[PDB]
Paper text:
Liver receptor homolog-1 (LRH-1) and steroidogenic factor-1 (SF-1) are closely related nuclear hormone receptors (NR) that are attractive drug targets due to key roles as regulators of metabolism, inflammation, and proliferation. LRH-1 is highly expressed in the liver, where it regulates lipid homeostasis and methyl metabolism. The native ligands of these receptors are likely phospholipids (PL), as they have been crystallized with a variety of PL in the binding pockets.
Strong electron density in the binding pocket indicates that the ligand is bound; however, modelling its precise position was challenging. Refinement of the structure indicates that the two SS-RJW100 conformers are present with nearly equal occupancies (52% occupancy for conformer 1 and 48% occupancy for conformer 2). The two SS-RJW100 molecules are also positioned very differently from each other: the hydroxyl groups point in opposite directions. Interestingly, the phenyl rings of the two conformers overlap despite the differences in the overall orientations of the molecules and the different sizes of the groups at positions 3a and 4. To explore the potential for the SS-RJW100 scaffold as an antagonist, we examined its proximity to the LRH-1 AF-H. Both dominant binding modes of SS-RJW100 orient it such that portions of the molecule are within 6 Å of residue L532 on the LRH-1 AF-H, which is in the analogous position to ERRγ F450.
Author numbering:
A (entry chain A): 300 to 526, 530 to 538
B (entry chain C): 742 to 753
C-alpha cells in the first residue's frame, strides 16, 4: 500500500515528457539563432540547460501541496536554499531510471557519451559528476523508485536548515510527516531491505554536499566570466 | 531576487 500523503505528493509531479520537450525546444531555437562564429561552449549550454530546468522546478514547487500555502517570501527562502540540490537530485534520478553504462541522460532526452563530456568538463566537474554517479549506482542497487524519489524531493525542499521563515512550523511538520510516510512506505513495499530507509536518508547529506560544491564551482565560473535565473539563484 | 519573486507571483 501507499500512504495517502505520498499519493498527494505524486499528484504534484510535473508532466515529464512536456517538461523535457519544452527544454529541448528552447535549446534548439537558441542554437538555431546563433551564427557560425558564436557557438555556445559545452559548459555554456549546460548552464542554459540547468537554467531552463530551474524554471520548471520553480513551477513545480509553486503548485505543490504545502508549498503553495506559504507566503511568497517563505517560498523564496526555501527555494534559495535547495535549488541546486533539486537539480542534482533530478539529474541523479534520471540516471537511475534511464542511465546506461558510459553515457549520461540529459533533461532534453539526449544520451551523451561520458568520454565526450569528461573530455570537456574539467577536473572539478568530472569529480562532482563521478560522485553523483556513485550515488546513482547505490540508488539503483537499492531499487530507488518514484515514490521514494518524490519523498526525497519534499525532504530536500522543506529543509530544516532554512532560517527566518514566517511559518517554520509548516516546514518542520512536512519534514516530519514525509519522513514518517517514507519510513512506512519502505517497510511495507520493501520489507526485506532493513537498510533502505537509512540508505535513502544518508544520500541527502551527500546530495547536499555535491550540490553546494557545485554551486561554489559555478560561482567561480561566473566570477571568471564563463557563464538568467541560474545567476540570480547563485547571487541570492 | 526579483526574478524568483516574479516566477512565484506571475499569473501566466
Ligand atoms: C556538469 C553539469 C552542469 C554544468 C554547468 C552548470 C550546471 C550543471 C551537468 C552535467 C551534464 C548535464 O547536462 C548538466 C546538468 C547537471 C545538474 C545540475 C547541476 C547544477 C547545480 C548547481 C549536471 C551535474 C551533475 C552532477 C554533478 C555536477 C553537475
Amino acid at each position: 500500500s501507499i500512504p495517502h500523503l505520498i499519493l498527494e505528493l505524486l499528484k504534484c509531479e510535473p508532466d515529464e515528457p512536456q517538461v523535457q520537450a519544452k527544454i529541448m525546444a528552447y535549446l534548439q531555437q537558441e542554437q538555431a539563432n546563433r551564427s557560425k562564429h558564436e557557438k555556445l561552449s559545452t559548459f555554456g549550454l549546460m548552464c542554459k540547460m540547468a537554467d531552463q530546468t530551474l524554471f520548471s522546478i520553480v513551477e513545480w514547487a509553486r503548485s505543490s501541496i504545502f508549498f503553495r500555502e506559504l507566503k511568497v517570501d517563505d517560498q523564496m527562502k526555501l527555494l534559495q536554499n535547495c535549488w541546486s540540490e533539486l537539480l542534482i537530485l533530478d539529474h541523479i534520478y534520471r540516471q537511475v531510471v534511464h542511465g546506461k553504462e558510459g553515457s549520461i541522460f540529459l533533461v532534453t532526452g539526449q544520451q551523451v557519451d561520458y568520454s565526450i563530456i569528461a573530455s570537456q568538463a574539467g577536473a572539478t566537474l568530472n569529480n562532482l559528476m563521478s560522485h553523483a554517479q556513485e550515488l546513482v549506482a547505490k540508488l539503483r542497487s537499492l531499487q530507488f523508485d518514484q515514490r521514494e524519489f518524490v519523498c526525497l524531493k519534499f525532504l530536500v525542499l522543506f529543509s530544516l536548515d532554512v532560517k527566518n521563515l514566517e511559518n517554520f512550523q509548516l516546514v518542520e511538520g512536512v519534514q516530519e510527516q514525509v519522513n514518517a510516510a517514507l519510513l512506512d512506505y519502505t517497510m511495507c513495499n520493501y520489507p526485506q531491505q532493513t537498510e533502505k530507509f537509512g540508505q535513502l536518508l544518508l544520500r541527502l547529506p551527500e546530495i547536499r554536499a555535491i550540490s553546494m560544491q557545485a554551486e561554489e564551482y559555478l560561482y567561480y565560473k561566473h566570477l571568471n566570466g564563463d557563464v538568467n535565473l541560474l545567476i540570480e539563484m547563485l547571487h541570492a | 531576487n526579483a526574478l524568483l519573486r516574479y516566477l512565484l507571483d506571475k499569473d501566466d
